[PDB]
Design a protein around this ligand. Structure first.
Ligand SMILES: [Zn+2]
Ligand SMILES: [Zn+2]
Ligand SMILES: [Zn+2]
Ligand SMILES: [Zn+2]
Lengths: 188, 188, 188, 188
DNA sequence: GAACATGTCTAAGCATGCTG
DNA sequence: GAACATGTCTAAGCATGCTG
């Protein structure tokens, strides 16, 4: 069986979609977050129908390039050495029921929190993600772009929905977003 | 009985076809993959009808030239010395059920994984292959072109489908593809 | 007592001097070696008078900048993780009597080999040093320039001579030497 | 103690010198032999005074470049796999008292034969060396130039004389000698 | 926020065993 | 013996965290 997780969008029967509200800036044209290391990066969860009780929200990173897709995305040794295991790239802050998973078969890391419906009178649910390395970190991502895959799962483990977005963790998110959007217009 | 495996295309009752999505680049005119050694090279499996449970996907290399077709394709001694047995040229990455076979009668190497139907909502299945020598490696392929033969087999061992593509593992796939396509146009 | 080792040149009663013979290139104007990581970098030992039997040759790195001089120079965690202890920056190759020292009081690293007089008919002695991080390595030298201090010591531990040279370990030694010499001429 | 053998010319008290008499061609300007793999390459031994009984003649290869000098020169794995141990690069043919040595401390290979004075009426002594890899062999010399060091040693192990010459083992010695001599004249 | 930093990428040219 | 082969080298430009 594949040890490479699917990245294909599956908005499913619940109409699952992500939203994004500088330390952080999202490019719709590129479907790509640009953010700074270890600074919280809010992601909104939107649904058309209410998921069942016990639904979970999982995040996982994979390398976007075909030559790297089968390699597990990990924290670099420098940032490892200085609740979350130090090897995990993606953390969730501000949640009392975070679980960190090291898959015993695929060795992939993921971080999971319960799905909480918006409060009476609210429109969406926000999760506070944190990326603990730069995209450029030697011995970690090493300048290789990643995707973050967000899956909505029921308590039985059924996939209910899947979305993903590219991430660049970098020192200058505004600069680098402008550069990439301009490159797209001129050479893409 | 022959110890030379058939290379003839047999797209069979399931409508079995290969797809190909630079470290690697595929030439449709040549039906030939150009890729770099030890860098993963994705191959898509397409079918018109769903194969039975237990279907397997086998890959095997053979020399394309008639003067070399009866010689087993193997890893060169240099790359052998530095799950897959070190003598095998072709590996599969990213799969938890890979099997490597050394045929006890023909001495041919092959690598097999279970056929997995595309996920609900997907269109095809990708296998992450890896070639561990350059076509030029002394004491291995020694500049001899190979074909990779992909067979779809049921659990009983019946051939269900067969496809093949030429491979050149080289340092400069883009350069070498351009050269060979130009040579085809001018002198083929 | 100080835990910062002296860097002051002491060419002493034996007339101790260093010589330097691209993966490496020495700038006399800057008294600075430019070299690549993990590539051997020969240093010549010259003396006017023959040192006693049992003389030893020690190498130690220290940060050149006053704000960093009291911090021990160490290998970065990435290059540590992939005879010499993995925390040591400076190795000696090609010698059967190397000793690596972690000072129990100062925590400084050094590497020592016996002094061998030139062979009958020779003029100097070469030691094959190796620097296992770039000056830029995150979590190690972190772009801070270092000096290497070479001391000639008798077996009793008396200082006989001392010399030092700046080091920049970098990807492009020729480029970076040209840049720094030009900057000296224009802005120094 | 150094595990790097000296290459410095020492023609010594016996006036020891080498002579060289296409599969083989010697460049005096470059002090460099150009020869083909596994084809015998005669080297003449000249002396002014007769060495004592029991004198031996040793040959050893080292890498010429400073970045490679501390690495032992070995046969590549391909030519290893197809009296001399298969790991040795340099063989002596036509001698009944050849000894092959793997140094237990330095791991360096060498090949030794007795020194035989020229026959009554002769002028020099010829040894038939054979290089069993090309300079270009992957996993062996890998395009790195070598020197061959020839030492005259007494039976007690005293060094009596030392000479050396660069070697390029290649498919086209005449071509490559012409190219290198021209490069010397134009760009050296 | 503009400029500097510095390991990496890229394309043209070099390499060197092999082919015709 | 001249031309082709094909992994490698080289220099200019790109990269991206850091400095001023
Ligand atoms: Zn990091
Ligand atoms: Zn190989
Ligand atoms: Zn480092
Ligand atoms: Zn060889």
């Amino acid at each position: 069986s594949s040890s490479v997780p699917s990245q294909k969008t599956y908005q499913g029967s619940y109409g699952f979609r992500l939203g994004f509200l500088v330390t952080c800036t999202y490019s719709p044209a590129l479907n790509k977050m640009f953010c700074q290391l270890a600074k919280t990066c809010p992601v909104q969860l939107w649904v058309d129908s209410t998921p069942p009780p016990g639904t979970r929200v999982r995040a996982m990173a994979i390398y976007k390039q075909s030559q790297h897709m089968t390699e597990v995305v990990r924290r670099c040794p420098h940032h490892e050495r200085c609740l979350a295991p130090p090897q995990h790239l993606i953390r969730v802050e501000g949640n009392l029921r975070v679980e960190y998973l090291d898959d015993r078969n695929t060795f992939r890391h993921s971080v999971v929190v319960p799905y909480e419906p918006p409060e009476v009178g609210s429109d969406c649910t926000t999760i506070h993600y944190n990326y603990m390395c730069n995209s450029s970190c030697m011995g970690g991502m090493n300048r290789r772009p990643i995707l973050t895959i967000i899956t909505l799962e029921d308590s039985s483990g059924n996939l209910l929905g899947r979305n993903s977005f590219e991430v660049r963790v970098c020192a200058c998110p505004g600069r680098d977003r402008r550069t990439e959007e301009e490159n797209l217009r001129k050479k893409g």
